[PDB]
Structures are given as structure tokens and as C-alpha cells.
Amino acid sequence: FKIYSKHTPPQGFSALEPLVDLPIGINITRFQTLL
Amino acid sequence: TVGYQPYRVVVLSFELLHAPATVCGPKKSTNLVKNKCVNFNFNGLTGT
């Protein structure tokens, strides 16, 4: 399971860097967010 | 105060292919060399 992130100070162009891969192996269908 | 007195026992079982490979031996790595043709297996890159 891989994540990519970036931070900037939505028009224009930018490029996303990775942070980490977790060798988890989970069947995934839902990504309930938190407020 | 041999065959009857207590002996501790630990049994190991490794799984495979259920989850990605995670637990295993160390990476026996050594020094590198400058300016000479070396056959180097570079953490998965096997070039010369």
C-alpha cells in the first residue's frame, strides 16, 4: 500500500513525491475519512 | 536435581505467500571501491 504526498502554499502544475510503502496486504474498497 | 528435569522449548513457524515477505535475515553488506571495474550486486541491482 503506497502513499504519495506534497505540500504547497487550485490552478497550475506540480509533481507528487512518495513517502512510504507499507507491505500490508489488505483488501481495500472503502476509505472513510475523519473530520 | 536430565530427561526428567525441565527443558525449555521454542518452536518457530514461518508463513509464506499469505502476506508480502517481511521477516528474514540481515543484509550482509561490505565496502565499495572507486575507479576499478567491480562486479557489484547493488541492493538488487546486479551490474558491473
Chain B residues closer than 8 Å to A24 by CB: 19-20
Question: Which residue in chain B is spatially nearest to A22 when comparing CA positions?
Answer: B20
Chain B residues closer than 8 Å to A25 by CB: 18-20
CA dist., res. B24 & res. B30, Å (int):
19
Question: Which residue in chain A is spatially nearest to B20 when comparing CA positions?
Answer: A23
Chain A residues closer than 8 Å to B22 by CB: 23
Beta bridge partners of B9: none
Q: Kindly list the distances between the CA atom of residue A3 and the CA atoms of A6, A20, A21, B42, B46, in Å, as whole numbers in the listed order.
A: 10, 6, 6, 25, 28
Query: At what resolution in Å was this solved?
Result: 3.8
Question: Which residue in the block uniquely carries the three cell numbers 508463513?
Answer: B15
SS3 state at A24: coil
Which H or E run contains A4?
A: strand A2-5
C-alpha cell recorded at residue B42 = 547493488
User: How was this one solved?
Assistant: cryo-EM
